[PDB]
């Protein structure tokens, strides 16, 4: 079938900003292109169609450019409604088939994160496993890297992470990162860290415990 | 105005059969085709085929022909998806959507408000809860954080308040992660003055509906262990 490539894959853009998102297609639809809104949780919204047509209702901000292979989603004064991600999907052939999105995300300044450690709690060892987690609070950009040492050795293949939306009030993201060992491994190490990297703090930080000291 | 509604979400285990269902108002049913979409989580939206009721005749992309059955009963103006045995990889949410043929294409201009569909061979189970709280001489700052870690509940969701919903600014509740045993975890942290860290209680309440449970979770930090 007919592959079609959004990018950027993601932006972060002011309210007022004008903006630019491109659709390239594998081979020729002529102008059989529409353009969708999706916020999370919700249904997409129909914006565009056959390149360049508003569909009613939509706010005239919203405008489509293009033909054969590559078109172009501009979005003139973007307003605080209009933070979500935007899908095009081409209808030239079946089977029909979409972009793989493009987030509108919110622009502000760089946010060093705080950085917090905790140990795991006496309930949790009780029952064999220890979590350790490592919470990097209202930072910005969202590109981060955290890293555990334990023993001062990099950690891999044993913990997970997860990321909020931007905050409501500040824009901003907050992160949270959990190294999961069995009790037997937690007792037997001394050291534990979480080392963070971030465009906001001028070399890494790091939030360690030591096991018998916390 | 048109409208499509979509059935309830559903928790399903591998090898089970699924109808889900998109029933229609607002407009002349049988004068429309009806397509179904796919969307994992946390990825794009994969088109799935349709049906026009009319005549009953479907399409289907390649990767889901054989895959599922789509269907429409005009009478009462529902189209279906459907499973004969579901995997954990169709874990999903689906949407139906409405087909209007504009500018020489067709487009999708209205769409049902989605059906999650889970599929594990995790068996319902509510959370155990255990406390956040920093070493006891490691706040330095004038801020401390707090949190609860919610661990092995199964399904989603979980709902999280902190202090009987009293306190609200400064939280952040995270989104769960699927761990390996099939079980979700999550955190919710609450950033909160150092100084209060003495005088004031923090207790998380979490609540799952698919288990029924509730637990709530002072949180501390004992001084030995
Ligand atoms: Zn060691
Ligand atoms: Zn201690
Ligand atoms: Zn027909």
């Known amino acids: 079938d007919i592959q079609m490539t959004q990018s950027p894959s993601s932006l972060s853009a002011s309210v007022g900003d004008r903006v630019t998102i491109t659709c390239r297609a594998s081979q020729s639809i002529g102008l059989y292109l529409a353009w969708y809104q999706q916020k999370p949780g919700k249904a997409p919204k129909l914006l565009i169609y056959?390149?360049?047509s508003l569909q009613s209702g939509v706010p005239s901000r919203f405008s489509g450019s293009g033909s054969g292979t590559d078109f172009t989603l501009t979005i003139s004064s973007l307003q605080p409604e209009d933070f979500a991600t935007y899908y095009c999907?081409?209808?030239?052939?079946?089977?029909?088939?979409f972009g793989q999105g493009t987030k509108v995300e919110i622009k502000r300044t760089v946010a060093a994160p705080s950085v917090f450690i905790f140990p795991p709690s006496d309930e949790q060892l009780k029952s064999g496993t220890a979590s350790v987690v490592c919470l990097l609070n209202n930072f910005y950009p969202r590109e981060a890297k955290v890293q555990w040492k334990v023993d001062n050795a990099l950690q891999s293949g044993n913990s997970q992470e997860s990321v909020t939306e931007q905050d409501s009030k500040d824009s901003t993201y907050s992160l949270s990162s959990t190294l999961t060992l069995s009790k037997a491994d937690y007792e037997k190490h001394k050291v534990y860290a979480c080392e963070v990297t971030h465009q906001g703090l001028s070399s890494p930080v790091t939030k360690s415990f030591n096991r018998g000291e916390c | 105005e048109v409208q499509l509604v979509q059935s309830g979400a559903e928790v399903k285990k591998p090898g089970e059969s699924l109808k889900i269902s998109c029933k229609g108002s607002?407009?002349?049913?049988?004068?429309?085709?009806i397509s179904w979409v796919r969307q994992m989580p946390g990825k794009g939206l994969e088109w799935m085929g349709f049906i026009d009721p009319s005549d009953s005749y479907t399409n289907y992309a390649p990767s889901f022909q054989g895959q599922v059955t789509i269907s429409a009963d005009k009478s009462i103006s529902t189209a279906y998806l459907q499973w004969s045995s579901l995997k954990a990889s169709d874990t999903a949410m689906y949407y139906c959507?409405?087909?209007?043929?504009?500018?020489?294409?067709?487009?999708?201009?209205?769409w049902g408000q989605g059906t999650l569909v889970t599929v594990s061979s995790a068996s319902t189970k509510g959370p155990s809860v255990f406390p956040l709280a920093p070493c006891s001489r490691s706040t330095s700052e004038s801020t401390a954080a707090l949190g609860c870690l919610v661990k092995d509940y199964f399904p989603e969701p979980v709902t999280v308040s902190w202090n009987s919903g009293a306190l609200t600014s400064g939280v952040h509740t995270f989104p769960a992660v699927l761990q390996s045993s099939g079980l979700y975890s999550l955190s919710s942290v609450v950033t909160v003055p150092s100084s209060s860290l003495g005088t004031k209680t923090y207790t998380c309440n979490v609540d799952h509906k698919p288990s029924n449970t509730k637990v709530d979770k002072r949180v501390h930090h004992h001084h030995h262990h």
């Open positions: 607002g407009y002349s049913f049988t004068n429309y085709w």
């Open positions: 056959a390149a360049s």
């Open positions: 959507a409405r087909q209007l043929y504009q500018g020489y294409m067709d487009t999708f201009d209205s």
């Open positions: 999907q081409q209808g030239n052939t079946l089977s029909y088939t």
